[PDB]
Ligand binder design. Structure first.
Ligand SMILES: [Ca+2]
Ligand SMILES: [Ca+2]
Ligand SMILES: [Ca+2]
Ligand SMILES: [Ca+2]
Ligand SMILES: [Ca+2]
Ligand SMILES: [Ca+2]
Ligand SMILES: [Ca+2]
Lengths: 255, 255
């Protein structure tokens, strides 16, 4: 017996933008701006950044109207920023298992992005295999490299597959700040200790078990992922959650 | 500013049992029965099935009191069933990406469980690899198997690593009904086309994109998984969602 507006509020607080969209879209008592804002947030949590740029004109209209930013990055950077928002949302809803499984794709992309900052032509040292198979290092081409970090990588006699693990090791040989390397070393241990087992195994898992296993809270891992992203040139607000900011905007409209 | 009961109703509808639990603990207007039931549901979605058995005495009381089943399977079967109702919850909230990633371990466990029925000594042919690595087949060991299924498996030449795809192939050589085999072949393609890239890559993805890729909805894949579970001796209500049933009990108590 809760009102349409009361239900909207609650869903916002748990970032249930799909459900919040269903309600507002199906009523008459809401602005066109709210349903567009909730369509935007919903498509964000479906990892649809293309929506933001396809409707960039209407997006800039609302930005001018309410004096708020809804898009802080160019397409490539926004892809990664948006994904981390979804990551923080799952964490705030205490979906720890979901959070953990979501770490792998963004970790790989950040690792690749950071390496390109250290070796610009890193694509040339990569054999692109078919979609299922892992890409492989061209160790033979890497010996001829003028890049000092690349040369350090070959001598070990590592295996060819390009995993997040091998990329993590590659980072350690670069001139990136130790804080960046430390975060990556810690996220690499994260992958082995909690992420990889949670793929074939069905085990009880929560925040307390995550902290017990790794020695750190989930918030620490999230913030370290953010620090990697921010250092790589991606803007992410770590003191003011994007979803919370937009939720407050939507609330001030119907309240 | 919705009331505590109005908010609790909304949270239950989206199975936000963590938030629902915290609201009900810090409240004054809810009985201790509702509190325990919400801890139960919260621990379920944290894949903690041990909670049900650690408190089976108190659980049994509420069962006979309110004429409801809170526990349907023995331990080994209940943890697989519990994972599935968690899987169904994510589906109903249209967390399609999270749903997809969550399919991997339950599929792997169901396939292994089915193999166990056809090959009683299946664990004698598996090398429990250390640490991060995939488990592997003992192909040399498999040759002396009196089991025709095993013999035909090694005869075809495969990868050492044991994946769900590998177990799926193994299933086809067993004595299982064809309907179960076709079910597993369908999910096998689900792994390859959707589940595998979504655990690795960052892509826009929702209910519609799953349909374009597979020709089926998420509910279909849920039901295929359920069909396997039921066939293997696991009880799971496909008509009455467990979480919906317990939610109704809770509602009727504070209403
Ligand atoms: Ca009210
Ligand atoms: Ca979409
Ligand atoms: Ca590739
Ligand atoms: Ca913060
Ligand atoms: Ca727990
Ligand atoms: Ca193992
Ligand atoms: Ca059903």
């Amino acid at each position: 017996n809760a009102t349409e507006q009361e239900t909207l509020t609650i869903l916002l607080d748990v970032y249930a933008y799909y459900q919040a969209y269903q309600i507002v879209k199906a009523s008459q008592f809401f602005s066109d701006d709210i349903i567009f804002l909730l369509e935007l947030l919903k498509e964000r949590r479906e990892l649809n950044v293309d929506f933001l740029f396809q409707n960039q004109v209407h997006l800039q209209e609302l930005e001018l109207t309410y004096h708020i930013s809804l898009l802080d990055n160019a397409y490539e950077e926004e892809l990664l920023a948006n994904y981390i928002m979804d990551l923080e949302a799952k964490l705030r809803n205490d979906h720890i298992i979901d959070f953990v499984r979501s770490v792998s794709p963004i970790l790989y992309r950040l690792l690749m992005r950071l390496m390109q900052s250290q070796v610009a032509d890193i694509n040339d040292y990569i054999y692109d295999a078919k979609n299922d198979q892992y890409d492989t290092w061209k160790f033979d081409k890497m010996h001829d490299s003028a890049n000092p970090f690349v040369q350090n990588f070959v001598a070990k006699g590592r295996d060819s597959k390009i995993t997040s693990r091998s990329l993590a090791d590659f980072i350690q040989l670069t001139d990136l700040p130790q804080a960046i390397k430390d975060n990556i070393l810690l996220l690499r241990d994260f992958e082995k200790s909690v992420r990889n087992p949670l793929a074939h195994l069905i085990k009880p898992f929560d925040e307390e078990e995550l902290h017990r296993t790794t020695g750190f809270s989930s918030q620490t891992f999230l913030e370290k992922i953010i620090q990697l992203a921010v250092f790589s040139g991606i803007h992410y607000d770590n003191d003011k959650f994007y979803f919370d900011k937009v939720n407050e905007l939507i609330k001030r409209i119907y309240q």
